[PDB]
Each structure stands twice: as C-alpha cells, then as structure tokens.
Amino acid sequence: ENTQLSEAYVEFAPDCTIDHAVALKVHTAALKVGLRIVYGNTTAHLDTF
Amino acid sequence: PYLGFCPYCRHSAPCFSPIKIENVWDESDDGSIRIQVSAQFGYNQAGTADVTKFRYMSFDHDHDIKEDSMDKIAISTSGPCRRLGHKGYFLLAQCPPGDSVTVSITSGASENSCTVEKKIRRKFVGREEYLFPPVHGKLVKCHVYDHLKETSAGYITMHRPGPHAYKSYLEEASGEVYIKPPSGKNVTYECKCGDYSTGIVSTRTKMNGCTKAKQCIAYKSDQTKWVFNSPDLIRHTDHSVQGKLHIPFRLTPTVCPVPLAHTPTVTKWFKGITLHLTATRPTLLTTRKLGLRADATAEWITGTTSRNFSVGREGLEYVWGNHEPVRVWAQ
Amino acid sequence: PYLGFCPYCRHSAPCFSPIKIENVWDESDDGSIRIQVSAQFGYNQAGTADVTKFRYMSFDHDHDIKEDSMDKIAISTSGPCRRLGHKGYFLLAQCPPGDSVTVSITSGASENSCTVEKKIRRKFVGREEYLFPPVHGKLVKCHVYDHLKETSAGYITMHRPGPHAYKSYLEEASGEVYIKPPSGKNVTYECKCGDYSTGIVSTRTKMNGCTKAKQCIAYKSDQTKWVFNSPDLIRHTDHSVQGKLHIPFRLTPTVCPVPLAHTPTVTKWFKGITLHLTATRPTLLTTRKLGLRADATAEWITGTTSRNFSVGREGLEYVWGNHEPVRVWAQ
Amino acid sequence: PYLGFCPYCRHSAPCFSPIKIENVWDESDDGSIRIQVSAQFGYNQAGTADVTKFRYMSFDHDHDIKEDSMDKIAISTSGPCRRLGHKGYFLLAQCPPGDSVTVSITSGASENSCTVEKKIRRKFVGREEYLFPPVHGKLVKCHVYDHLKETSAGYITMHRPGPHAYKSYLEEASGEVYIKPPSGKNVTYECKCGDYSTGIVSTRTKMNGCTKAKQCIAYKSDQTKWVFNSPDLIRHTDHSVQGKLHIPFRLTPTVCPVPLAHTPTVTKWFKGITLHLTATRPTLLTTRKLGLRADATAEWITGTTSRNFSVGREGLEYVWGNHEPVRVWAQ
C-alpha cells in the first residue's frame, strides 16, 4: 500500500521563441497603391487607397 | 550534480549515471546540437567558473561531488562529435547524422556513458540540397545556435533536492537495526518498526522494535544545493521554484551561404517553354501561372532532365533553386 | 594456433594470417556475435588459462607459438566493436551493423587483420522495431548468447596437424640439395630425386641424385598438438577425431524489455471501426475476423495514420504492436 | 608548397590550408583513389627525396617551408582510408565509401584538415556484384592504379609564383606608412599614395604621401620556386609554362578475379526453358534469340527465382553472370 503520485504536463519548448507558427484570421483586404503621375512637365509620386 | 537513470549505460542495461541525457534540441540550421545532462561543465569544485574542468556526482555512499577535466568527455552520434561549447548544465556540439546521441566520460579505464535516441538528420537551408556551405553563393536568412557562452534561449527551474536514501547508513546486527552515519554529518532517519519514529543521528545509533534492515531509511540533510526538476528524483516535500538558470546558446538569426544551381537552358516553342536542367543534388523547381488560376507546381530534381511548360498570354513564372523568380509572357 | 588463408589481409590481398575467421553466427536476439578464428584466447604459452594474454602462430621458419595481450586485439564491422567474452578458440562481441567483420591484432606497428563478409543486420524482438531496449515495456521471451565463459553450445572436433613443409629447411648448393633442420629438432624429409627416399635428419644432411631444390620436402614432427579441422590445412594421413572442445557462449533463453506502442484511438460507425494510430517506428498491426473466414491482415506502419475496419456480428480482433489482443462485436 | 582555400577546414568554414585538395580521380577498378593536394610528400626540406617526411607551407609572416613526418597524415572518407603510396604532389589510397574525402595532418594538437565532396561508390568488375574479390573465380581484364611511385599518367604544368602580399611587412605610425621587411630579404613594395611608386627595400623604410595601411603592398621576390597552376593564387605577370611534373600511379591494365555464380538448373518444356537461379548478390542475366530478331533482354536479380524463356528452332543464347555464353536449339 505504497502509494505514488505520477504527474506530467506540457509547455513551450525553450527555443519556440523563433520556431513558432502564429494563427491569424483575416478580413476584407484593403489595397493601397503607389502612383507616379507625370502631366506636361511636372511629375509626382504619391500613395493612395 | 544529480545522478539519474539513463536508458543505456556502457554495456547494455539502463542504469544510474551522472551524465544521463534527458532532452535534446536539433533545430539549428547548421545542425548544431544542444544537449542537457545531469552533469555540470565549466565550474570548479565549489561551483566557481573554471573552463578546463567540470564537476559531477560520486559513485559512493558518501556521495559527494567529484571532478574531472574537459579533455576526457566525448560526444558521438554515428562518429565522434566536435564539442562547440559548454555552460554548467548544458553542452553544444556539431554531430554527424545518426539515430542516437552518446555522451561518454573516460576517467582512464572508468568509462561511463549515456545514450538516448534522437533521429538527427542532416538539414540544410535553401531550395537545394548541399553537403557543405559552398564558398560562393547567395547569403540568405538562417538561424544557428549562438556559440557564445553567455547567451540565453530561456530558463530552467531548480528546487531543493529531496530525500536520497542509502543502505551503508543502515545495518542489521543480532536482529536489530542500527544506523551508521558518516563522520560529523547530521543524518536524518525515519521508519515505523511498529509505531512511527523519526529523528537525526550524527553517530552510530540503535533502534528499538526494528527487526529488519529494510524497515528504515536514513539520509543526510543536504539543503545547501539546488537540483533540476528531473523526472528521476524523488522531490522534497516543498517543491517551490527556488532557482532559475539561463539556457545558453540562444538560437540566433544570421546569414548563411547557399549555392546557386546551374542556370537552365530555355528552348522555346509556340506558347511555351522547354527548360533543360542540370543539378548534381536534389534541387527544387517551382512554377506558377500569372492569371486567375495559379496552376502552381513544385518538384525536386536530380541529375539532368528537361521539362515542358505551357505559357499563356497572361504569362508564366518559374523559380529555379535559389535563383530569383523569372517571368515570361507568350505571344 | 594454426594460421589460415584469410581472404583479406591488412592491405588488399588474401594471405596467411594466424587470425583468419572461418565462420560467424549472428542469431542472438541482442545482436551479440560469436566469432571463430584460427587463434585462441585466454591461454598462456603452455596453454594454461590466463585471461589477460593469448597465444598464436609465428611468422618464422621455426614457426613456434608466440603471444600477446588482450588489449591489442580489436573487432570492427562498421565502427569498433566491444568485446564481450573470449574462450580459447572463440570470441564474442557486440558490433554495430555492417556488411563484413574484421579482427585485427596491433602488435605495435605490426598490424595483422582478417576481414570476412557477413551481412550483420540490426535485429529486434517483438512486433515493433526499436533502436534500443526501452526502459519501460513488456517482458517477452528471447534467446541471447550467454556471456558466461563456461557454457557450451556444442563441440568442435580437432585432429593431429598434418605436414607443414618449409624452404628454409631446404637449400641448393653446387647443384646438390641439402637439408638444414633447426637445432635439436628431428625433422622428417622425403622426395623422389629419381627413386623415392624418406627419413629424418636432425642436422645438416646431403641428398644424392637431387638436382633441384623444389624436388624435396622437410618438416618437423609435431604430434604434440591438436588442430581444428580447418579447410586451409593439409591434414595428417590418419584424420581420426582426437579432441572435442566446447563451443562457448551457448544461446540461452531469457527475457527482454520491449516497448508498448501508443494505444490507438477508436472512432466508430455502423458496423465498424476507424483506428487512429501513431508510431514513431515501424510497428505491426494484425487483425482478423471471428467468423468462419479469418480474412486476417498484417501490416507495418510508421508515422501517424488511420485504418477503417469493417466489424461484423461475429466480431473483429486486433493486435497493435506488443499490446494484448482486443476483441469487438458489432451491433 | 603553396597553400590555398579549402572549402572545409577543421571546424566549419572555408579557410586557407597547405593541404587543400582540388581534384580527385576514382576510376580504378579496385577502388584505389588518387588525390592531389597543394602539399608535397616524400621530399626533404630542400626537396631531395625522403619517403619518411614531407614539406609544406608555413603559417607565419615569413611563410617559409616547414616539415613533418609521414606517420601524422591521415586520409578518411567515411572511415579511415589506408594509404597506398605518395609521390610529391600526389597521393593514392584505398578507402571505404563516402560522399566526401578528407585529408588531415595532426601536428600534435595542431590539426589541419581539408574536406572536398566526391561521391565515391563501391565499384566492381564483371556481371555480378561482390563485396570483395573472391579467392576462386575467373580472371578478367581490369584497370587499377599502379602502386609504383615511378609510373606516369600524364603531366601537370607549373609556373613561377605570383605576388603574395603581407601585412606584417606593412605598418602605420603617426599617420605614416612604413615597411618592415624580415632580415636580409630584399622585399619589393609598391603603391599609389597619390602618384604611383615602386621599389625594393631590405630594411625598415618610410613612404611619403601615404596616409593609410591599406594603400600599399610588400612581398619578397621568391622566384626560386615553381607552383602548380592552382585557381586560388594570383599568378605572376608572365604565366609561361616553365615546369612539367609527372602524374604518378598510372591507371595500368591487369587481371582481376571475379566470382562464378551458381550454375542454373534448366527445367524444360515444349519450345522453351525455365531456368532456376540462385544468386546471393545482384547478378546479371542476358539472353538473346539467334534468329533475325535478337529480342535481347538483360536484367539484374538477387535471391532465388525462376525465369521462363521461349526457344525457337533458330535457338536461344543466354549468359549467366560471368559464365560463358550457352546456346540452345528447340525441336
């Protein structure tokens, strides 16, 4: 009548800080575009949605 | 410096060694391997840092802490492994591919080894196999265990050691159980020999009502040390976290060189391509169409071969090994 | 201590060495290997038992019996092998897997090795492959070679040595053949130099009618020894069996520890099961129906997978690895 | 004794060693391997023939030619390679199968190795695989590298060494660059520190207009030696061919022994054969019809099997392993 408690559990491996996957859920994809416009002699760069 | 139950000692059988492995990590892109054994490294007898020697557990009923030098430890998986670094509880070395890892101390003719299974596989980085990092090639992102001793990949928790019984402490004489503590060490003992009984004896003491030697336990109160949470020790009553020590050799990012495969030869025809490929090693070719439907395919080739690919007006893209993507548009 | 025509010497060729293996056994469940060479071990110069030394054949025209120590013998198949026992003519050692076995004596720089082909394959016991005997597992029946020196797996028959000619014993001078026996040893000689002639000379003696050194033979009468019935030696005229020496390291039965695979997960449906299986190593699953028709199937799996099995009213039986058989009956 | 850029030194990285391999030949039927490293063997310090020792390049800023003995070099692919011979720039050795070849010099603890990839495979001669040349069998035509040191497979071209800059020769002090040639050696120097300048200094000399160490170069005029046309050296301005040295160990033809496989058992029926075959090793069977159409087939088998072959009135021919061709004609 020699009782033993046996226990175990899990955690993150010590080097998971670099080797790890992340689970994400995305929504409607917003597109943003960079444009160069040249009119006559004048050109311009700009980013727009 | 605890000693625990290795599954494979020197000869054939599981048994107790100071240099049991318990767990292994092999994720470094170089194949550098980090090992944890119950032994220590880089510390002298009192624990002060001294690189040339290490301390470990004794094979005696006094069970003190003994010592030896770095020149007589060896690591081997299939052939001998080159040690890269050591920090207290931890080792790190380069190993050839194999199925299990062995740590061995050769104290002259006193050989003590532990072996544990781990399918270490020669790994590589990039889109092509290679035996060695070539002299010339692209520099890409990789992750290698930092050889520096003073890095930290994490921490491990240590606790006060639990009871550690012995039999030289006990003795049977004329049907009576006596205890024989070593010199000057207050040794705590307990048993029921009938009713329960406990105390501490520093000298040879007799027991009443005790008919068999197996009935009792004695051990010295060594609370001046901290031991890892190993699964092969009976812990103390109070298992509170009492120490943390760093996990050296953090898996740091860096740059690695990778070969550039032979540039294929393109042979062209009506709406499509025939790529002629040469690759001494398994190298990955990955193509995809540039339209609504990707039709992407990926495959590893060896030797020399040729692949036909239909190219639409929308175009086709291919990546050969580590070479940059190449785009095409049919006429 | 005869010397056999080892197919493979140190360098590339067949030669005559004192350590020729002639045959090998590899049946023992632990991979223990029993080897038989023309040398003997554990005996001193006169043959009396001395573990630390062995005697063997001489590389000279006196061809006496020389000696060396155990520490300079080595066994290797793919890597070095650990010697487990030795008894006169026989050796026993554990070896890594390989295609051939090599025995080597290192008498300083005097290297003498014999190599013989044998596809030694890492074998195991049970219904699942494993690298090593695990610490925890079922205890099953095995047969291993007994490490005890004084066991006997049978006997080997020995006879008198036959004639061993030499050319130092003979010489040519002025077109006449003389014999030159070593000191004090009565050396038998014979030849046809025209008509036949035979005798014994203990000292330098001349022969008549003999024009070529190749015409005659001389050799000392060594009837004080017994030699194995080797296929490399010309036997005595009377090849009666005259000695029987035991074959040590009997293959004795015992117990082995064997792993227990992961217990599968049963996922169920109308008259049948879907077993989800995980096994890091090739493990055998064997099932059979409990009706008139067995329809039994057996297969080895690796990795993780799932298998659908129809179960009738009569029921189904399955055995997973070393786990006990399990029975089921459909509703 | 040039030093060059080995892709794999002792530890992990490409670096500069005197014993770099550049190319390997593995075409000899016996598996003998001929190697070329930048070191030269069998010659004493002045270059005079001395088998026991060799000379090689120095790891110092004087960069003279140093020496060691033959017993401290080693060749290894998967296990140690047995050396067979050496002549100056060239080595030849027999060794086990592997994916790369390694030369290593062990000057005590001073270990310097070069490793280069080469898929060396066990090759054989005949129509059947075998590990090892058997004692009994047919003698067939083969080609093996001749172990004789004084053979010649060709020639290699040597030129005068080109410039070899050094940095101990240069120094910066108070924003002025000085040169420090070693004792008594006329060291040529040059740079543009503004305008161009060149000369030779045998003693510590100052330069004008020079503000940085990196601006100039100095090196001794060592025209008394010839170096291989290696791809890791900057050549002299005049790369005329000036020396030719023989390529030792010419691949000579000779006879080799090959096994004779088990003769088939023919089981016969109306217009055809059923050959029963046993072959422990992969052995080639090749048959062809004796009429207008050959219908020839060739295939390797292992184990024990049986093959049915239709035989016409014109007949059939079969060759089993190394056995002679056999002809048949149906009734």
UniProtKB/Swiss-Prot annotation, chain A:
User: Post-translational modification, briefly?
Assistant: N-glycosylated.
Glycosylated position list: 41
How does the entry describe its membrane topology? Single-pass type I membrane protein
Compartments (UniProt record) = Virion membrane; Host cell membrane
Q: What does this protein do?
A: Class II viral fusion protein. Fusion activity is inactive as long as E1 is bound to E2 in mature virion. After virus attachment to target cell receptor PCDH10 and endocytosis, acidification of the endosome induce dissociation of E1/E2 heterodimer and concomitant trimerization of the E1 subunits. This E1 trimer is fusion active, and promotes release of viral nucleocapsid in cytoplasm after endosome and viral membrane fusion. Efficient fusion requires the presence of cholesterol and sphingolipid in the target membrane.
What does the subunit comment say?
A: Interacts with spike glycoprotein E2. The precursor of protein E3/E2 and E1 form a heterodimer shortly after synthesis. Processing of the precursor of protein E3/E2 into E2 and E3 results in a heterodimer of the spike glycoproteins E2 and E1. Spike at virion surface are constituted of three E2-E1 heterodimers. After target cell attachment and endocytosis, E1 change conformation to form homotrimers. Interacts with 6K protein.
Q: What is this protein called?
A: Spike glycoprotein E1
Q: Which organism is it from?
A: Western equine encephalitis virus
Q: Which residues of the full protein are shown?
A: 896 to 944 of 1236
Curated annotation (Swiss-Prot), chains B, C, D:
Q: Which residues are glycosylated?
A: 186, 308
Subunit (UniProt): Interacts with spike glycoprotein E1. Processing of the precursor of protein E3/E2 into E2 and E3 results in a heterodimer of the spike glycoproteins E2 and E1. Spike at virion surface are constituted of a trimer of E2-E1 heterodimers. Interacts with 6K protein. The E2-E1 heterodimer interacts with host PCDH10 (via domain Cadherin 1); this interaction mediates viral entry to the host cell.
Listed disulfide bonds for this chain?
6-114, 9-15, 81-95, 142-256, 191-216, 193-210
Lineage of this protein's species?
Answer: Viruses, Riboviria, Orthornavirae, Kitrinoviricota, Alsuviricetes
Q: What is this protein called?
A: Spike glycoprotein E2
Q: Function, please?
A: Plays an essential role in viral attachment to target host cell, by binding to the cell receptor PCDH10. Some specific strains may also bind host receptors VLDLR and LRP8/APOER2. Synthesized as a pE2 precursor which is processed by furin at the cell membrane just before virion budding, giving rise to E2-E1 heterodimer. The pE2-E1 heterodimer is stable, whereas E2-E1 is unstable and dissociate at low pH. pE2 is processed at the last step, presumably to avoid E1 fusion activation before its final export to cell surface.
Q: Where in the cell is it found?
A: Virion membrane; Host cell membrane
Its PTM note reads: Palmitoylated via thioester bonds. These palmitoylations may induce disruption of the C-terminus transmembrane. This would result in the reorientation of E2 C-terminus from lumenal to cytoplasmic side.
How does this protein sit in the membrane?
Single-pass type I membrane protein
Protein origin, superkingdom: Viruses
Q: Enumerate the Extracellular topological stretches.
A: 1-331
